[PDB]
Amino acid sequence: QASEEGINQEKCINEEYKIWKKNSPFLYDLIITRALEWPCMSLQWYPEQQIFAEHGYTEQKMFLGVRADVGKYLLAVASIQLPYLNQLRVNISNLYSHPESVCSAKLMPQDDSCVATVGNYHNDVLVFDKESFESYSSASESPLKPKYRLTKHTQ
Amino acid sequence: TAPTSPYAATQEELLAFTTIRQHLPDTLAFHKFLELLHLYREKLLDKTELLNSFSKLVRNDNLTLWFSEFIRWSDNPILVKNEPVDERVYLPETFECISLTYRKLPDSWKQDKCSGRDDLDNSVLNDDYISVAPKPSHVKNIMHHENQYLQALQLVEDERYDYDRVLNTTESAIKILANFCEPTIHEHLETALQELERSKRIIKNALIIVYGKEHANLALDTLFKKLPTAAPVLLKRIKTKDQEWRRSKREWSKIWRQIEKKNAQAAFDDRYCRIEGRDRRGLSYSRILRDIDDIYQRQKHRIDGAKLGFQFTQVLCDSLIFLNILRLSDAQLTNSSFYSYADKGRISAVLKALLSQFFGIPLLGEESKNIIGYNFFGNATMYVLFRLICVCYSRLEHIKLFVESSTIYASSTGGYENILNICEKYLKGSCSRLEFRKYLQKFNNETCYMICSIERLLKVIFYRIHEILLDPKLGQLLLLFESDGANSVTTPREQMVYRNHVESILAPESKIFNMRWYPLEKRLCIQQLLPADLTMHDFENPAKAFMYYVDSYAISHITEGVDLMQVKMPFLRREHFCKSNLQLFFSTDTYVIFFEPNTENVYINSYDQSSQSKKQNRTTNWRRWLEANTDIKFFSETT
Amino acid sequence: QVRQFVSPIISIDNSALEPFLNRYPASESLFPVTEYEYTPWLEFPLLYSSIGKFVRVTIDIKWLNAAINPRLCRREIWGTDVYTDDSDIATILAHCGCFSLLKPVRKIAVVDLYILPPLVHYKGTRKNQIESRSWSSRQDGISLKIKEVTWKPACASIFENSIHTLTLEERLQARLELSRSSTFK
Amino acid sequence: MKQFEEQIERFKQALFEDSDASDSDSSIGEALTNRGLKRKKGSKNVYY
Amino acid sequence: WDLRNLNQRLHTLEGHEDIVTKISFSPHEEPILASTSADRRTLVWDLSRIGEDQPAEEAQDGPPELLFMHGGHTSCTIDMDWCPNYNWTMATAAEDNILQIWTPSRSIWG
């Protein structure tokens, strides 16, 4: 009996889908849909930018924290192609496993290398820096360790 | 010369309106003006709003005033009062019943007296029981009066009655007034003035007829005073009117006689008339459509537990009856007068084709056909055509069965066939209708009364078919039919793309009608499909259902089987390099879409003081709208 | 500089009906006699014996849609502020100004209507873009007037909200499971 | 301009239209009441 | 909310018919505000349209200070962020493992 409601609901979710998909070329000037591996808990745009004028685009950067699974909690960096006005893919890379969960991962405004990460699973704030990302090696069995551990809270 | 219709457009108003359109600088402005008028007609456009838009399109004051004068506009406080009706008009049905219709009276109603009752009548008459008739509530099969040759006679009789009452009134008034006109009238006036009070009504009615209900009182008074010189002018007028009306009645009685002859003969048949009237009132285009629509609407919402499915079902057994119908059709077609020489061939061909192709009438590895029901998709015209054909078939077949099973006219070799040959004769013009009907009367049967309706049914059918032959969208449609008469056993996707073709060939507004043929049972089923409806209602297992759905989601313009009453549109109703890498993943038990990872979809379209000033207007209007150490800190931070 | 015209005012004097509206006292007119579930095929009975009491109708959300309801377009409403008992209750709501036809509604309605003796004249006036018709002959039913309209705080429970009660990560883990088997592409 | 004249006449007829009228093509048969079936071409002549 | 008048809600924007979760301003123009909610939509409001007039049919989509509405997702959108290097562009991550980079047409705001 509850199936009926759930399946109807899922179906109109699908409905909204291609009814947005169908009239997209009359609504947007750009659409890039990416089916990443994992659920991305957060995103933050990167203020540094590459401009490939002769090639004809720009790449921006993105910082994601995703879960692969329960307990598999990871971070990644993406490069994003935007087209050029003045005269096309989403690339995942830089994937480092996190010690515990990420609910919010904020990078310092005037220095990208640092990221304060916290999650719904721990009361400790873990702040990462240059060396922590660059001393990590994807071949290693252990995750990173942040620049500092900040703990005052109990939740 | 040419006749003026009621409330016909006058010349002044047509002149003024064409000058209005001329002042309107564009034909687009004229079209907008027609739109204003039409939207006011369709109860979406108010009066004052019509005036306002008219002025904001005409930009001229005198024409606005002329419109407000033509629109008959008046701004006053509309007063609405609600007055209940008197207690005695409904109170009876609260009285303590005694029988079905007789209800005991309450003491407050046995409290008024009749003053001429003696001691007898206070013991015979009934005092405390009323007769409260019963009240229908929601009658839903209304009978009509079908005899239309009886009502013409009744109209003749009413018209001559109305002439008579008038002529008689003017006669009597002429008599009295002419009595009041003489030389010696001034002498003995108080006697004539007494024969006028005793006859005031006849003269009042004569005045009402000759002048009107406004001048009647005037003339009556003015003659009560100035009698011996008012009487002659009235007499002259009334005699002139009388003469002309008598002259008119003569010349129209010239015609009443012919009416009475013809219809008096042909009006002693309340058998033929009920049948024919109910028939003709049944097979009206809009009535057919409304019937099927009502049934469909009752299904969609499950009002009485009725679930969706088919709305019309009927079995067509014989295969020769169709050839009989074709025979009758061609017989009548050679004797019509609407269509030119080639349309006869066209319509005969179209009927033959749609009969043979669809109905499959000749003009462990083979059952797959009889298991696949053949599908036809069309619009209202096709549905009406097929309803007519099924009705004609049903009536012919009932005729044949009744001729055969009934053991009186079956004893002849071809009684049914005799009927067929007689109808053949008649439809070509070789026999008239009187012999036809009197010969029909031999059967004494309403079931055999039903044979005459074939001419009407065929006329409607020919009309539909012809309007299809001029329907330029017909071709593909029937051609599409031809196409789907070649498959062996269809997989859904073919039928769905067929249906999408059909639904596309029509305008965006239309319905679809689905007609399905089961040659195993030889059954015709009809249904009505709107955008988001299921074409195949029966699935024997959830896996089959999921398969058909996914196929539909793939191809079908709008997913079949989804509750449109629940969709909520997700947007407000207001050198390029593109690469698509997306696979729609489905579950088979929850229908959730997933995506296979590493999917890229990109859409690219290659094609300031305004923004800052809008920002500033925001700041300004919003600030205009607007008008503890915390305030200390803030005011340290303010400017 | 455009001329601006003002459509007139509309005044309603339901003062003669006062002995009926107040026939029964308050505190003893709490329960409607009978209750109906609106559908475009609803027909009240004759209710002569209970004049001065009220009934309770219940309208679903789909019925208040000018596209689903077929009766909404025929304009079957006679009267102003007191209507014949043939009138379509949806049109009564939309004409007495309890919702708008252009914006779609999202709640269940519970309407409570009065029962009133017939009237001598039913006046038809245009409001909210709904032009109720007029009846000058004698009516044979009774009349209805809106006593009060109450909307349902919860009409239906969209399942994405019932699952919205669950925690993000928890419900997200069951998401991954469904993504595994899926039995098809 | 014949079509325009027909349009003007149609608009005049719409203005001319009475406050209360019968729109449905089907008329009221015998039917002995008007409840339910008003707007039925002659239902002003019928009552209890 | 405005800090010199905190006794009073500055204004209230309507249009989501269940829980709204998260919001963000545009780092290029201030009058543009983005909001994400549980009904699978993200709404963009141009606040320069307080108090404006709107036609009858224009009132269907919501108050006139509503600008745009994006619903290409299929579940609760997790979060958003504006790309600060390009105008009118935003990236949204949702619960169904989907990322969306999108910017509306010029025509609505140009």
Which residue matches tokens 């007789």? B102
Give the SS3 label for residue B284. Answer: coil
Residue of E nearest to B613 (CA): E48
d(CA B499, CA B493): 10
Calculate the alpha carbon distances from C80 to A40, B364, B540, B553, C58 in Å: 59, 71, 54, 49, 22
End-to-end CA distance of chain D: 50
Given resolution (angstroms): 3.2
* Token reading at B323: 């050839």
Residues B561 and B377: their CA atoms lie apart, in Å, by: 18
C&D contacts, CB < 8 Å:
33
Q: Quick check: B615 and E31 CB within 8 A? A: yes
Interface test with E, best of A11, A14, A40, A52 (most E CBs within 10 A): A40
The end-to-end CA distance of chain A, in Å, is: 40
Which residue of B lies nearest to E51 if distances are taken between CA atoms?
A: B621
CA B360 to chain centre: 35
Nearest residue in chain A measured CA to CA from B554 = A18
d(CA B256, CA B259): 5
In contact, B386 and B515? CB cutoff 8 Å: yes
Cβ-based contacts under 8 A for chains A and E: 99
Neighbours of B608 (CB within 10 A): 8
Q: Is D34 within 8 Å of D46 (Cβ atoms)?
A: yes
Can you list the alpha helix ranges (DSSP code H) found in A31-153?
A: 130-135
> Side-chain half-sphere of E84: how many Cα atoms within 13 Å?
12
CB contact under 8 A, B9 and D8: yes
Q: Inter-chain contact A33–B559, Cβ cutoff 8 Å? A: no
Q: Distances from the Cα of C107 to the Cαs of B296, C59, C60, C155, in angstroms?
A: 26, 9, 8, 5
Edge to edge, what strands does the sheet with B374-378 contain?
A: B312-315, B523-529, B512-518, B374-378
Determine the residue of chain B that is closest to D9 in CA distance: B9
Inter-residue contact E96 to B594 (CB < 8 Å): yes
Are C54 and C32 in contact by the 8 Å Cβ rule? The answer is: yes
Contact between B254 and B154 (Cβ < 8 Å): no
Listing DSSP states for B430-492 in one string gives SS-HHHHHHHHGGG--HHHHTTTTHHHHHHHHHHHHHHHHH-TTHHHHHHHHHHTTS-SS--H
CB B43 within 8 A of CB C75: yes
Mutate to test the interface with D, among B14, B27, B132 (most CBs of D within 10 A): B14
In chain D, which residues have their Cβ closer than 8 Å to the Cβ of B42?
A: none
Contact A9 C158 (CB under 8 A): yes
Q: How far is CA B27 from CA B9, B22, B23, B50, in A?
A: 22, 9, 11, 19
Give the separation between CA B365 and CA B374, rounded to whole angstroms.
18
Contact C160 A9 (CB under 8 A): yes
The whole-angstrom separation of Cα B251 and Cα C81 is 55
Alpha carbon distance, N-terminus to C-terminus of chain C: 66
Backbone φ, ψ for residue E32 (5° rounding): -100, 120
What are the chain B neighbours of A37 within 8 Å (beta carbons)?
A: 597-598
List, edge to edge, every strand of the sheet that includes A148-150.
A104-107, A115-118, A125-128, A148-150
**CB pair distance less than 8 Å for C160 and E95:** no
Exposed/middle/buried for B140, CB within 10 Å: 0-12, 13-18, 19+?
exposed
Q: Which helix (H) or strand (E) holds C52?
A: none
CA distance B343 to B339: 6
Q: What is the DSSP letter of E38?
A: T
Measured between CA atoms, how close is D46 to chain C, in angstroms? 9
The CA angle B411-B414-B416, to the nearest 5 degrees, is: 100
Beta pairing partners, C145 = C114
Residue A61's H or E segment, with its range, is strand A57-67
Q: Three-state SS for B196?
A: helix
Whether E50 sits inside 8 A of B621 (CB atoms) is yes
- Which residues in chain E touch residue B582, judged by CB atoms under 8 angstroms apart? none
Query: What are the residues whose beta carbons fall under 8 Å from the beta carbon of B198, sequence distance 6 or more?
Result: none
* Residue listed under structure tokens 């009932």: B398
Query: Which chains border B (3 or more CB–CB pairs < 8 Å)?
Result: A, C, D, E
What is the rounded CA–CA span in Å between residue B629 and residue B619? 27
Residues E98-110 as b/e (b if ≥16 CB within 10 A, e otherwise) read bbbbbbbbeeebe
Chain B environment of E1 (Cβ under 8 Å):
none
Between A15, A20, A88, which is nearest B577 by CB?
A88
Q: Which chains touch E (3 or more CB pairs under 8 A)?
A: A, B, C
H, E, C per residue of B25-82 = CCHHHHHHHHHHHHHHHCCCCCHHHHHHHHHHHHCCHHHHHHHHHHCCCCCCCEEEEC
Distance, in Å, from the CA atom of E67 to the CA atom of E82, rounded to the nearest integer, reads 16
Given an 8 Å threshold on Cβ–Cβ distance, is A31 in contact with E102? yes
The C-alpha angle with vertex B417 and arms to B411 and B422, in degrees rounded to 5, equals 120
As a whole number of angstroms, the distance between CA B383 and CA B291 comes to 12
DSSP letter for each residue of B565-596: TT---SS--------B---EEE-SSS--EEE-
Residue B15: name the closest of B73, B70, B56, B72 by CA. B70
Strand ordering across the sheet containing C54-59: C35-37, C54-59, C109-116, C143-151, C83-84
CB neighbours (10 Å) of residue B170?
22
Compute and round to an integer the Cα radius of gyration of chain E. Answer: 15
Tell me how far apart the alpha carbons of residues B527 and B515 are, in angstroms, rounded to a whole number. Answer: 7
For chain C, the chains sharing at least 3 beta-carbon pairs closer than 8 angstroms are A, B, D, E
Residue with tokens 């017939």: C118
Buried b (16+ CB within 10 A) or exposed e, C71-95: bbeebbbbbbbbbbbbbbbbbbbbb
Q: Which helix (H) or strand (E) holds C143?
A: strand C143-151
For residue B465, the tally of other CB atoms under 10 A from its CB is 20
